[PDB]
Every structure is written in C-alpha cells, then in structure tokens.
C-alpha cells in the first residue's frame, strides 16, 4: 500500500502520523546536577519511545514488515529518531535545545553531565544546519522515516519504500520552485546530515549504555532493552 501511494499522499500520511511534543516533568529547578538532568531526559525519552513505536507503525511500509524486522529497525534507529526530533524542535531556538516546551537547554547545562557537552554541540550544529537550509516540515517527516527504514536495513521492499520517499522528497523541492540542479544538491545536503545524526547517535549511545550512565539514574525496562540492543558489543 506504500508503493501504491502518491507523493502528496505520502506527505499527508507522514504528517498525520507525527507524534506529539511531550512535556518534561514540571516544577523547574534548572537541572544543574547530572542526576536531575539525566532524570528528566530519561523520563522524557521513555515516554517518547511509546509514541515513536506507534508512529513507526503508521509509516507506510513498516507494518508490512515482519515483527522481527520491525524490532530490529526500531532498536537501531530510536536514538537517531529522538535526535532528529530534538534538532527539528530546536530550529527556532538558536543556541538552545528544546527537549520539551518547558525544557529549553543551552550548552552550559550540557556540562552538568560528564561528557554530554560534546554531543550537545553536535546537536546544536545540526539544528543550526537545518535552520540555514530552511528545512520544511514535509521534508523533516520524510527524513525521519528514512532514518527508521535505512538505519537497520543492513530487503528489496525496504529499498522500494526508500526510493518512494526519495521521489517524495524531490517532489517537494520541485514544488518549492527549485531547479533540477538545486534539487539534487538539496537532496544530497539533507541525506549527508543523516550521517552526522548517525554519528551523534553512536557517540551518545556508547555513553548511555556505559556502566557509569546506567548507575546515575534508574533507567526504565524498555529504555534499558533499547540500549541492550546496541550493547552488542563495545
């Protein structure tokens, strides 16, 4: 049913499959300790995972996969998908990362957790990169879907859907009035950022499943299982 859909139908489906922007735990106290910082992030990410899972099942072609394949893809891409969400939300907040509408953080708070500020800078640069490119919402949901399907594909069906999203991405740029040259260039620019998102995920992951970051805050069972999938090995 995914391959049969058109470009505008693809966009419409992805736009309406979008998860909500969840809030952090209220009562502020700007997270100055690494315990409170990790606490808020872990809690937030854990709640987002539930929405992400139901978001994935509403992505055209994902349901058509076996349950085993669905698990593998989500295991590989879950931090990537959280990150591209974060940088997308943080576009109109330069110099700051909008984890939640009630949780806006700068790089200074990134120093609260030992070794997290390196990745905050990368996230801020990615959000900044997206800003100057004037990344549209229709392109973002295309990029996020690509991350889900591509990051664990290494299967003719998946690549058939990946091509369909590519057709969709170009269709958006064509409508925006970009010339053919501006179309391949922008498409290339967007996909190269996915490599950086992968990089941030891997560097972030190896900290997250480290024994030090596992002991700072009691992690949920689900989040712990999503980490364990990457902890093979190090």
């Amino acid at each position: 049913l995914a391959l049969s859909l058109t470009a505008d139908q693809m966009v419409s489906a992805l736009l309406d499959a979008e998860p909500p922007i969840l809030y952090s735990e209220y009562d502020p106290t700007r997270p100055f300790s690494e315990a409170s910082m990790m606490g808020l992030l872990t809690n937030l990410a854990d709640r987002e995972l539930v929405h992400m899972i139901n978001w994935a099942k509403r992505v055209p072609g994902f349901v058509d996969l076996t349950l085993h394949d669905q698990v593998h893809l989500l295991e590989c891409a879950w931090l990537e998908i959280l990150m591209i969400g974060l940088v997308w939300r943080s576009m109109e907040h330069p110099g700051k990362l909008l984890f939640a509408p009630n949780l806006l953080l700068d790089r200074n708070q990134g120093k609260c957790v030992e070794g997290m500020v390196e990745i905050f800078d990368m996230l801020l640069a990615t959000s900044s990169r997206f800003r100057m490119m004037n990344l549209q919402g229709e392109e973002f949901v295309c990029l996020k879907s690509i991350i889900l399907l591509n990051s664990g594909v290494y299967k003719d069906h998946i690549h058939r859907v990946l091509d369909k999203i590519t057709d969709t991405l170009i269709h958006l740029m064509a409508k925006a009035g970009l010339t053919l040259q501006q179309q391949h260039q922008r498409l290339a620019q967007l996909l190269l950022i996915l490599s950086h998102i992968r990089h941030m995920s891997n560097k972030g992951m190896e900290h997250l499943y480290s024994m030090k970051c596992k002991n700072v805050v009691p992690l949920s069972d689900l989040l712990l299982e999503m980490l364990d999938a990457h902890r093979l090995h190090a």
Binding site: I53, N54, L67, V71, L74, E75, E225
Partner: peptide
C-alpha cells in the same frame, strides 16, 4: 521476550 514486541503488537 522483549517489551518492544508487546508495544508493536497491541
């Protein structure tokens, strides 16, 4: 078994 299985089945 994994929790991820259950949430995907639903």
């Amino acid at each position: 078994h994994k929790i991820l299985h259950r949430l995907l089945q639903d």
